[PDB]
């Protein structure tokens, strides 16, 4: 029984208890997290940018069946087209605006690879990606505003694909954590 998560901590709360099983309803995980109203008090000791690029702050690592963090966004800040590693990938926002770009799969002979679709990700919204839909790049694309997400992925890893545009090569890339439970770790 799917109820309004109040407060972060109790959708974190309500996650464990959807990931308490080894299957996933997607659907019932995106809708609680539209569900939660950003509070952006509640989420402040996460939200470490860097100048550079864009963060990625672990907030719990859910029993072990996933883990969630917080992914801050200087202006202009924006990642590489990347799979989610067999897992499945879930992105609300809970400041600014996002623009997820989607690919397909890259055939094996190296061509452009072209954008399919792309949507602005607004405050509060939720979007849900896997491998079986495609490959995904994520940008702030503002100009004046920093943006914040929340990610859950499951199950946690922390190696994926970033994909060139221009070929459809894929390199193997390593996730790093720019803070845990709101202590920098360099
Ligand atoms: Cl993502
Ligand atoms: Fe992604």
Known sequence: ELLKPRTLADLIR??????????????????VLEAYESNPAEWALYAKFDQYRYTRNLVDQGNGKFNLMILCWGEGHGSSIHDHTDSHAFLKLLQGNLKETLFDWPDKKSNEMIKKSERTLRENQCAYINDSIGLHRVENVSHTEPAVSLHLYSPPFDTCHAFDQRTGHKNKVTMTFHSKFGIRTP
């Open 14 to 31: 309500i996650l464990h208890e959807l990931f308490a099983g080894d299957e996933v309803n997607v659907e019932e995980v995106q809708a």
